[model samples]
Target chain A: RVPIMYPIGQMHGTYILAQNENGLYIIDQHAAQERIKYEYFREKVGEPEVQEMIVPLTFHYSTNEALIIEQHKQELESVGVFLESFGSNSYIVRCHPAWFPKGEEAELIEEIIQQVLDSKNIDIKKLREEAAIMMSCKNRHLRNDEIKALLDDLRSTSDPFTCPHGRPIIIHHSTYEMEKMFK
Target chain B: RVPIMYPIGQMHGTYILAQNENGLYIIDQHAAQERIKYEYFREKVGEPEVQEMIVPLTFHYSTNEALIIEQHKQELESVGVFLESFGSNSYIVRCHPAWFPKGEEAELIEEIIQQVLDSKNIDIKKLREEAAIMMSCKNRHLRNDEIKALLDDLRSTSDPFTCPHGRPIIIHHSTYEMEKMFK
Candidate 1:
């Protein structure tokens, strides 16, 4: 079972939410930062290794996008995607990382590179971190029991700490708050 | 809005479940009956026809399954499914009626046909009805507001009456039952 992300709301860059506790429990912000670091480590473990295609497949692209593709090809190659210029405004995917599921590989790789090109003004490090977060969100699948355990862990963390995304994870209401509600 | 089916529990062929506020609704002894009927009817309306794949899809099955598929091909076809033999042991999917989402078309057709095949020994009409109920259960997707409306609708329905499925669609635990629980 994949862990379900329930959106309670957001504060600053941090997201405040609850999990399956019959009610709700707030997660810690720093834990998310830890999650981001873990994700970066995991991605580093698997560098892109390209395999040649028997038959070259061509996909069209816009002129600006084409420029972006060319500029980022080397950077993307380090991540395990191999693209070769095919014709004017088109490219052939010669190789991609092995982890991509069949049928969706090209689309996913192209999407990642395209995003990098689109965010030209943003710092590359920030872009890389964002990419890692996106990938982690997609690949992580957890069982229901594991999800419950993780929620418990999140709730027990230190007060007022935000996840890596800088969002406070928890909120509390005292018995006095309940009495006020009745009044 | 499609009615959402939350499985309360299953006993024998009967499913004890509830619809939004309709209180408790019992499903027919036969699962997926309402769904089958609804799909069949929906397909009868003017819609783009379901396309058959050039190659039939093959599914693994048991000896009993083989007999069921062979016998129910025509019946399945009548509901807009066209299954063909792929090889000595495999089957291929040719077409499915229009109504279901195209993405899930193949899986839906295969599962429905397989269900028919599984219950081959039973009366076809009864099976068809049950299949319709099952389909209803599968297809019903209700939202929060819709669920509230459904509950209100249930209040008007006769107590302990069966929904489209043979199962009781509602049950009332009188105040006496509540009192007993407290005691």
Candidate 2:
């Protein structure tokens, strides 16, 4: 739940440093922002603003996968992953969460819904778990403001220590410890 | 990782806002700086400093532990935990990392030395890992110049994404992603 105030440096092409009371906060662009994506995907999805597709796209799946999709349709809709039956094994994606990648919505929704149906766990829980991972893989960059807000916003989470994927989420080095280290 | 140039507001107790290209970066004094400790503890312990104690305190332990400590004197020296035999199953703490704590020297030194001596892949690697964690739980802060430096000093090693502890550090949300997220 470490927050961002200002970036101090950029290292490893993927990591960056933020200034804080203790020392420097090292941030891995991938894991950290992946965490941010996890946040928006998990916590901020409160009735995600969705966009309707101009042309509802469709995707096909194997028989078993198709059955899972059909059965779990309600669960998917609970999370705003709207889809409709097409011909036989395909479904039309009408809309996706607005915060989702705009262009990638159709693909992501179809992929996640169908993929989850492909059978890891047919629940939205596991589906989101996987989708959150994909979201972080994108090139997520936090503005200074966003970082600060994120830091502040993290205190109330269930797992403030690591992201949903179990990456360490925050740091709280003690001045006392720094004193010991600096000793 | 996101970066901040300056703070805008410090509302929400020690919370603050930092201005940047797109949005205002906020720093929850607690969250923003909590990560500072993480960075300093990890990745920042470049070359450790050491100091010797005049009184040279000591601790009691199992003969087995004492034997392990005495036998591994060279290994202990390698990590800067200087020690010598005391009366019985005990060892006197002499010199330790100059940067190590002062008054707590005896306790910390004996504890770590004894701990590392205990079991579980007895290697300096594990010791360093544990010590870093202990180091972070302590309060630590940074200066303005340093913040600026960290902001500018990143390129390799996975963007040092997230702090070594894994907080998403700084962010340079691409105009592209922001273009979408802002939507």
Candidate 3:
């Protein structure tokens, strides 16, 4: 029988709460499928390549913000973003440093700059996490229709237990549990 | 007229809900009072002097927590906290940094740390706002019996319209708005 699927909420991937008469079960479709797909994607992408912008994006910030930008410049450079001080309160995004999916370069750069300004203190780990989430949220929103296709593709995969965030995407409530509730 | 005050849920501040001829009016007493008091206190405190702890407190964190700690270390330091990495997964609180009322240091430190961790990527702007609210919450609980004293103090202040977070403690709803709702 084809397993029933329903949308609950997403941590990073779709969460489906499922129910059956005998017992309840929680399933994560993305994580179970990603183990296979991620490896394939990684092999295909190989190594990240930096793409420089033709026209640098200029952004204005406060004095404190400028200082923070300068502090994280090296880390930013490592990630493929090349930001330079245009003046005391402005910065020029000269290059897109990371290998991103097509059409995401500008937004990726904007998000990084915003994260830097928002945090105002440099921690490489925090920067990477924020950048990762921003990238993921952007990419996911960009292809909402594609997400349904991706979920469909994963339907054949085994061990559909958890999502990338280690949350169960599907949960089942048994008839026994429901009866207990009534009692 | 005497204002009726009551606790609202598990949240830090007192939410005063008053019934008028038309409807109910809600007031956030803590925020309304805190805004006035914080400004006065901010002026009085004027350049907070760092207070070093006699015994440093150590906090253990996950990888994500460490990232957040690193991001806000400077701001934390500025508020009079001396944090040093004890190891890869732990941070040592060499000193409690904030200049709050005496005897509330440990709780304040813990609250600040938790807020910093919860704030996604250590956004200091949010941290400051959360910190202010946390401080108000702690003070509100501490001064439970002094509500009358607080009201008397508030009457002497200028901006009684709102609190530090710019949320109003009291709002006046026109009788017409209430009449319309009934109809």
Candidate 4:
């Protein structure tokens, strides 16, 4: 179980300060929320709730990359990237997983296709994890109630200490350590 | 010479953020200024720059403690505390060092007398140092120029890393350590 943290307030609108029995905690708001989004997308991406686009995302690749993307089309499908061939060197994206980051849909879709091209294969689990990380980084307030909600969501994530990109989300200064510094 | 640090901005109105070739540095504004004041007062406290007051600070003590304070009068005088005998157990402070925190004269003078009463002797060097610490703790702006002036003052202190009371004044995240955390 995560240590119970009470929201103190927001710091510079970039970090969150919290207090508990232990001491002060300084949380990187961006990374903390990124972890929350990562975990959410990780699970949701595997489910493939297709989100249809009003205007489809299109990509033009070299003939080689297109041929490679075609060969691994099923691998992409497994993780909710449905690409339709437009021409020998182009593809169109009509729908994607519902969890794709809003406004970053085209960018993320292109990255997934590039991944398939580079590996000539896809690991659905890794794909899902990467997609989640991508989505999470793309997304703070101190309405006391709102702050508490974010901490609750963070605590529920599989990893609360580090974001998907492996940077620390929160750093704690325990009461003892603080006293030691002064002493 | 200290590393040349460029101010990134202020954090929470309490910490000053600066970047150098080394990486990011977080400075506690209170302690940073405290160290600056401590060093300043450490030198000035010994000079006995007296400030006259229209209304002298007065104090009352038990007869026994009054006798104790009387015996240590010379010890107190060594550090700019001159107590005139108002009655058997009452003393009036008509003046004090110019550097005493403006409104804390009574409290600081009382504590200094209490010290003499307890120790029966005073180490002038220790007394000056303690006075400096007291003066420093008693006292933020990010006017671009104002912030730069603070960092420059802090960098020049004898020990910039910790305040007079030994609490860390600044913490640094080295470029390498930061990259390692993300790696």
Candidate 5:
């Protein structure tokens, strides 16, 4: 757990300036949020709950499509997707991973299935890492008070200083150093 | 030395997508430029180039300012600056670090001096790292031809995989990976 600090002000609307008994802190709001969200999204997809569908995704495919989708049931099951074949060239996806949020199923289903068939070898680590980074970056800029809340939320994180992308979230300075800039 | 690979296309104008015999490479144009310029700027400032003036600019300051400037002469000297005082509160900046490009001396001098006085436990590494990253990002997005030039420049760098801020500069996918996505 990192030490908690209250923000005194913001600099350039992107950095949070804070002080404690120890030192002055400069926090990169975008990076801090990315670090926080990356871990959250990674954990979300790592061990997923199976989401049963109201309508089974029944589909038919040619022999080549069989080679694409049929050969990857184990891969599907490993990621908490369950599928079955009723007969030759006939299949239905009864359930999918619960990691996706509402309204993303259609688009995400298409993407995941395509990725499964596309990725020459299954590599979940790369899949999750890329997903988390992109999503985190997409929603980085937040409301002003939102960051004040994040600073409070950050203490629970393992490392507040370093983001998953390896960017530094904070830089520090001392009063003596601050004073010297005048001359 | 890093091998040269040329870009064939761009992914959403953010990622530079290219291919070679080795594999398909996705260069994050932003991150790659940051890594390149950060290294360039870091190297530029890291070297000591003490510039001695024919006629020194003799000056005087208040005791507090003297403390600010006088004490930091040693710091400047370490970065290739040399100064001396003939009498109390009167000093000559006999020489300063030749730390910038031909056209940037006027603006950069004040900044470097201010930074020298202000940086409370100085870390030259961080200064150069931050400078290069920010400057590179500011000017990275360019026409196709300029980036073609940079692709050539990248061949000589020791490590171009990671930017100075530790973000990934290049991402790789196979033609298999590409074909799968399209199909």
Candidate 6:
């Protein structure tokens, strides 16, 4: 069952402190949002929900690296990073999934290319998971209303407790334990 | 050097959240005060500073119990419980140590007497320790200024981390750990 948590305040501009019948809940705001975003992107990652960039993002590599990337060109497009060989030793990305972070599109596309070159056999599911985490981490000293909205969003997530990286997003200190401390 | 914790706020009307170079510090207000009061009372407890009552506190007992109480009369006196036989089945208490909680004098005296009746011998040090815990436990949703003073007092304590009963008064979440959560 989903735990019910009401926002108390944000701590250190990072953690969201919440209260309920149980006790205090300390949530890592970044990790909490990561978990939320990770689940959201995980489903739609490889689907053809593409947005073409007005100005294409490009990256250059050595001749050997470009040949390696060429071998995995079809595999890269399978995950929605549409890369075209721009010149002899460069690749240009004209379009990618709608989920790709706005400003981080170039770096993320570059990282995806590196991942493909490093391993000949690319795993789209794993690539998408990596991309989702990249997008999530790329996204907070959230304000009161924003913090509330974030928590509401977190609760609706499939797995709200841990981030994609397997670190805990929230930790609970139960009311029973709090009472026992005084006893 | 003492760890400097600047108070942020009180949580659940029990814990005090503080910030410093380290990170968030969660302090159990009751346990923190217990540690402080325990240390304060530990030194001065059993010292012969007496308070007299205008109306003597009296308790009655059966012949068998009165006989048992008669044997430990001197032992009880050593701990500052001045009990005197008023009649065939009664004892009256005119004075006790000044540190006994004012409203709880009769109850504490009765407990002390029951302890004397149960054990043929008493450990004055252990008795005083027990009394100190009782007093400390008996002692909040404190205000901003009061919470700040509590943190300050806690720093001055020799063992500020745990209460007299050996429960932790404060737990720390370091800044490094907080940063690593996002990483």
Provide C-alpha RMSD values for all models, in order. Answer: 26.6, 17.0, 30.3, 6.6, 17.1, 4.3
Tens digit of per-residue lDDT, candidate 4, span B1-183? 677677655534565666666776667777788889888877776665788976788788898889888787776776668899998799888998877778887777877777777776667677767766766767145754676889899889889888876688877777676545444
Instruction: Pull out the clashing pairs in model 5.
Output: none
Where does candidate 3 stray beyond 4 Å? A1-183, B1-31, B40-46, B139-152, B155-158, B165-167, B171-183
Best by TM-score: 6
lDDT tens digits, residues B27-83, model 5?
667666666776776676556666665445665667666677765665555444355
Candidate 3, B66-171: lDDT as tens digits: 8878888876655445678898979777555345757787777877787767775665455555665566655244233454455545555666665665555565
Model 6 CAPRI quality: incorrect
Residue-level lDDT of model 5, residues A73-113, one tens digit each, is 66655544465886887677777666655555544555555
Clashes of each: 41, 64, 15, 0, 0, 0
Residue B115's lDDT in candidate 3: 72
Per lDDT, the best of the predicted structures is 6
Determine which window of 10 residues in candidate 1 chain B has minimal summed lDDT.
B8-17
lDDT of 6 by residue, A1-183 (tens): 667777666667777777777787888887787788777767666567789886788788898888878777776776567878798988788888776778777777777777777775666667677766666666246665787788888888888887788788887778787666545
lDDT of 3 by residue, A3-31 (tens): 54432212223222223334433334444
The pairs that clash in candidate 4 are none
Docking quality band of candidate 4, CAPRI definitions: incorrect
How many residue pairs of model 2 clash at the backbone? 64
DockQ per model, Cα: 0.01, 0.02, 0.01, 0.19, 0.02, 0.17
lDDT for B62 (candidate 6): 86
Error of 1 at B69 (Å): 89
Tens-place lDDT per residue, model 4, A111-167, is 777777777766767776766676676714465467788899999888999888778
Candidate 5 Cα RMSD (Å) = 17.1
Q: Ten residues in a row with the worst lDDT in model 4 chain B?
A: B8-17
Show what share of the native A-B interface contacts model 4 retains: 0.27
Question: Which 10 residues in a row give candidate 1 chain A its minimum summed lDDT?
Answer: A8-17
